[PDB]
Structures are given as C-alpha cells and as structure tokens.
Structure 1
C-alpha cells in the first residue's frame, strides 16, 4: 500500500486492488461492484498499485471521459509506469490530435471491414462448433473463446497463426501481467515483432491490416513508421484480448441459465438485444485518465498528475443507471452502459466485436442448444485492465445437439 498523499482526505480511502480484488471468488463484476455499496463515496482513493482515484458511479465516469481538458489519455493505465510507457495510437492522444488517427483505424476494423470479413467469421464459428458438437464437452476458453477471435484477427492482419502463443502472451502482460514482464517490456516486445513487418509492408504494400495502416494517410498526410507501429500494437491488443475474454463470461452465464438459453432459442431475433444486455452485465474493461491540472470534481480536490481509474465496467452495473443491475434481462428497456468506452475514444472495434458475439450466440445455440458447467467445476475469474475467465469446462448430451 502506497502512503496516503496529504491532499487525499482519510475518509475517501477504499483500498481496492484492480489486479486482485478481494471479492474475486464471487465473480469479477461482483468484485468490482463492492465499490458501489451504499457506504462507498462516488469517488474514492485506493493506496493499491501506487495510489489512484476511482470513480465508482456512471455519472462521474461519463463526465470524466467527456472532459479531456481535465482528464487526459496521455497516461491511461495503472500503475503509473504502465501509463507512462503506454503510447498506443489513438488511445494515448487527446483531441484535437487524436481524431485523424481514428479514421485510419476505421479502414481496418470499422464497419466496411466487418462486412468484408463476415463470411469468414461465420464460417469459422460454424467449423469450430460443429467439430466440438459430437464431443459432449469442451474447454471453452481454449477450444473457442481464443481461436475464434484470434484466428480471424491474424487473418485480417496477415500474420501467421504460429505466432499466436507469443503475441497472446505479450498482450496478456499488458492487461493482466503475471509479473515476468513490466508493461514497458511487453510493449517493446510487441513493437520488436511489428517493426520489420511494418517496414516490409511499406516496401511491398498488400491487403492486410498492417499494410493498410502502414501505408495510410491521416488528414491527408502520410503516416510515419513510428505512428503505424503505435497503431498496429493497439489493434493487436484489441484483437487478442477483448472479445476473447467477453465470450467466456457470456457462455458461462448461458451455461448457468437454461431460461435465458430458452429465450434465445425460441426467439433468435432477440440475439442482438441479448448481446447488448450481456455487454452491460459482463462488461470487462477498466482504464483511466491523468489530471492535467488541479481540479475540484464532485466536491473532491484532485491534484495535477493524479491518476484516476474510470472503470468502463462500472457504469452499467450502477443501480442508479440500471434497476437490478446484476440481473440479466434481455427485455431491459434502456440498457445503459459504457462497455465500449465514452467520449472521443469510443471503441473502434465495437462493430467487429458485436458481430463476433452475435455470430457465436447464434451458431452455438443452433448446434448446442443445451449445455452446462462441468459437474463440480468452480469457475475462476481474473481481473485487470481487461478482466477474464481462467477456464470454462462445458458439458452437454450430444443427443440434444443438431448438425446443420
């Protein structure tokens, strides 16, 4: 625990550890939701991970993400060393500078590319699931959650699948470090991988996402090799460690709730709405901002240089935003959340993510309508910048399945 700074009043201290929260065994979202109990202020200080603020309510989280003048993305990760090393584009930039880079990232992960890839995405989901179907069991994280998103990303980026274990290792060190590598070491190893590839593809442009970024333009001028590398690194992290984790939360929930499976089997047209409500309930990202200047925010004195975690996960779990927030209701009238962020940094990969999620729900429930958590299994979550599921053993009776 880091010594309490003199400017932080003792009454605002709640020593929450974002990388190993105390209530983790209850589930990761539940573990974070302790910050939303009635006795906890809207804005707390934790002495964990070097000391930082945490906004605990949707109203404050949204407000801070909108106000880039006071809350800068220049240093968006905790601990400070990670945030300081963090230089991915566009995320480490504030408007006005940030904006031009979004358009280029959209050329590779935006709606047009999602439309291009939809066939291969559907094909891979169907292929993976049909292969598992007659087995009556799987290790979901290894057998589907990882390969389905990752193999599609590797295809899009024109990278060999043999590189997956290395890259997945590095990306996991930036979000849920095991202690072997600092964020800076993992980032530099990712850049080390990308540097020769970016040079190659600037010399001989191709069709893949790295080529497109590396040869792209931003507001009418050429992207630099450095800028390309900083954007490609971010795309790799997004491709390898977002949907991969979310799919497991969703499938764990469905495995534990026959009534929700029944709902989507009976009325498959509800799947997009289900996706949205699952994105709220099993929201999984938490990054933040740095104070650009001394600022009074909701009665609290923040100091220039203070880090503030603004957990995207927390907005939709806020009872003030959503009644009975821990309850999954596919018919929820107003699904309020910031799962894909808020303000000028709104997720660029969300259209890809939604497609991958919706394709998975549709194709899984078609073939394996009934399934459960393996007898006696206790599902363990993990927490970090992006939270996840350590393992998800599923079982089903093959006699309840259908080959398409």
Structure 2
C-alpha cells in the first residue's frame, strides 16, 4: 500500500537488486528511470524512495545532515550487524573517525604503494597470458583486490597463499551464511592482522590508521574491528567491479586498446574518464529530518536509494555522458562515482591508482584481446553492479 505523502504518479515497482534487463546491461537497466519522475517510490524491498534524476541524486547524497548513513541498506538488519566505520557514521562522530582513516590513505602513501601494487597486477596478468583466454571476472577481477589488500596491510610474503585462500569466502559471498556469519568470518580473518599492528605498529595501512588517535583518545578494539571491516569490504567488490568494466570497455573498443598502447601517457586521463563512464555503486540513506526534493517530501524514517549511475550518465547533468572523451576538463570530484560530500570515498585516490596500474600492466603485457565469439557478457545489479562473466580471448 502507498503512504499518504507519496503521490500515485511517483509509484514504481523497480527492484534495486534485479533491475529489468540488468543481466544484459546494468547501465541501460538503471537509465530506464530517466524516463519518469526524478524521485520515485518503489513498493519492492519494503518500500523506499529512489532518486531517479541527476540533480536529485547529487543533492540528496550530499545532504549528510538530514539523510543519515546509519541504515547501510534497504535490507533490514544489515547495517545493524555491520556497524561499519566511518561508512555508517554521521556528524561529528563520523568526522572524528574519518580523519585518521583518510590520513592512512593520503596521496603520498598511495604513490609509495604504486610499485608494489603494479607488481601484483603484473604477476596476475602474467599467470593468465599463456592461456589465450580467461573468464576475466573469476580469473582476474575478483582476485586482484584481495591480493592488493594483502599488500596494503603488508602480510608476510610466505603467508599469502594461506591468506588468499582464507579470503575467498569474503571476495565471493555464497550463502546461506547469514550477515552475522559473514561479519564474524571477516572479523576472524582480520583479527590476527589488527592484533599484531595495534601491538607492534609497522608502516602499512592498518598500522598507520590504528596508531592515530580518534578525538584525542586511542581506538578501542571494537572500533578497530569495525573500521578494518570497512576497509576490507570497501575495496573488494567495488574494485573488482570497476576493473571488470574497464576490461569490458577495452575488449569492446579495440580502438582504445590501440590508443592507450600507442600513447601510454593517456592512461591516467583514460582511467578518470572510464571511472566516470562506468559507475555501479548505489547507496542507502534514512531520513532523520523531513526533506523536500523534486516537489515531494521525504519524511523522517523513510529510506532513500541513490544510484551514482543516474548522476554520471544522465544527459541532463553531463553532455553526451556515454562518450568516453578527453576534452571534458572534469575533476573526478564533480561526478558521483566515489560519492559526494562528507562520506566521499577515502579510497578514491587508491582506486584511481589501481585502475591506472591495471591499464599499464594489462595493455603493456597483453596482446590485442577481444570478447570470445560464443560466450555472453552478463552483469548483475544490487548495491555494487558488476560483470558476472567476461570471457576474453587473445593470441598467446
């Protein structure tokens, strides 16, 4: 049934977990909403708003005061279990915890990690090259972010195979494993690292965040658990999705493979343009004050779902948004791939470096590649949309 403050003409049944046609094209599936009202109420998933036009997505995402990050998701209970830091915090509390995390991920540290992260991408590329084909999502995209994670926290080289296998439960969620079991599995995986780095700080990512104060006092052990869980989960599916979309683009645009092999100096600019072009992250908020938007009122307690694709790819917000082009002069902060305002991805710098290093190694090390002739590209929806299969072929 429809709440009184929701006009009948704003009602849709859009399921954010499986948008119609999402398996063929995630972007086209979401863009169907640009043909309707800029703020719609879906009856699916318990009933919630969906921001459905660029200016609305952008405005509501940035309103951290009236639209709280506490809820995490439209699925009940998920946020209550995960308690991510800083992702789910508001206001002064959020600022106090974000501060040391952002310090940990600053550009100087990202730049210092570039050679190690490049070596990880190169090693993985070289393991696949002799085959002449791969299932890129399962053989590369879903493998790289966990390998990078182990590098970021500097695990001993000899523990990597064990730690890589332990990690597979978390990079590729299965079921029936409940949210509580997944939280517990993540914590148990992370605990030995945290214990070591809080006792004996090194110079890795965890050590550097955990040796900083929060609001002038030490991290508690539970806050460390919550923050570390956020760092692990925040960099896994998002990076896998983006790397897959970048590879899919190149496979479909042999002219861009040729361009970036001829002009490797265009890789950074191509990484920024591809990140703008293929956003797949959507977020939830819960209203803590009434919010007027697009001629309706989101009431306290209502949930709001915000798809970044409907800012970046809305022709009303950006000109010819589906063209990959180099004359936009657009700082990455001006689009919504990494979010907006107070909660904007702390890993934004690191993600850009990972995509650049991927392009350098894949293009530099691989011959010309293409989609397989008889297998399809499939995608999925949910909060982080992604390729589920990407079959590539090349002459080895």
For normalisation by structure 2, the TM-score amounts to 0.91
Q: Is the counterpart of residue 141 in structure 1 residue 123 in structure 2? A: no
For normalisation by structure 1, the TM-score amounts to 0.89
**More divergent stretch after superposition (80-89 vs 93-102):** 80-89
Is contact 1:214–1:225 with CA below 8 Å preserved after alignment?
A: no
Q: Is the counterpart of residue 163 in structure 1 residue 159 in structure 2? A: no
Q: How does 1:327-366 map to 2 (within 5 A)?
A: 327-334=323-330, 337-366=335-364
Q: Is the counterpart of residue 275 in structure 1 residue 271 in structure 2? A: yes
Cα offset, 1:140, TM superposition: 1.6
Cα offset, 1:197, TM superposition: 4.5
Matching residue of 2:249: 253
Is contact 2:367–2:394 with CA below 8 Å preserved after alignment?
A: no
Matching residue of 1:75: 71
Measured in 2, the distance between the counterparts of 1:164 and 1:13 equals 45
Measured in 2, the distance between the counterparts of 1:171 and 1:96 equals 32
Matching residue of 1:309: 305
Matching residue of 2:392: 394
**More divergent stretch after superposition (155-164 vs 222-231):** 155-164
Deviation per CA, 1:5-56, whole angstroms, max 9, x where unpaired? Answer: 333222111211111111113311221111112xx10001111111110111
Partner SS for 2:40: strand
Can you give the 5+ residue segments of structure 1 that lack an aligned partner in the other structure?
399-404
Is contact 2:117–2:151 with CA below 8 Å preserved after alignment?
A: no
Q: Is the counterpart of residue 203 in structure 1 residue 192 in structure 2? A: no
Measured in 2, the distance between the counterparts of 1:32 and 1:292 equals 27
Cα offset, 1:332, TM superposition: 3.8
Deviation per CA, 1:339-375, whole angstroms, max 9, x where unpaired? Answer: 0010101111111111110111122112224110111
**More divergent stretch after superposition (81-90 vs 351-360):** 81-90
Cα offset, 1:196, TM superposition: 5.4
Measured in 2, the distance between the counterparts of 1:390 and 1:121 equals 24
Measured in 2, the distance between the counterparts of 1:220 and 1:194 equals 25
Q: How does 1:8-157 map to 2 (within 5 A)?
A: 8-37=6-35, 40-157=36-153
Cα offset, 1:200, TM superposition: 4.4
RMSD: 2.2
Partner SS for 1:49: coil
Cα offset, 1:195, TM superposition: 4.3
Matching residue of 1:223: 219
Measured in 1, the distance between the counterparts of 2:103 and 2:290 equals 38
Q: Structure 1 segments of 4 or more deviating over 6 A?
A: none
Matching residue of 1:402: none
Is contact 1:44–1:56 with CA below 8 Å preserved after alignment?
A: yes
Aligned residue-pair number: 390
**More divergent stretch after superposition (328-337 vs 20-29):** 328-337
Q: How does 1:371-390 map to 2 (within 5 A)?
A: 371-390=369-388
Is contact 2:24–2:377 with CA below 8 Å preserved after alignment?
A: no
1:83–1:11 Cα change, 3 Å:
farther
Partner SS for 1:97: helix
Is contact 1:171–1:186 with CA below 8 Å preserved after alignment?
A: no
Measured in 2, the distance between the counterparts of 1:32 and 1:186 equals 28
Measured in 1, the distance between the counterparts of 2:185 and 2:127 equals 35
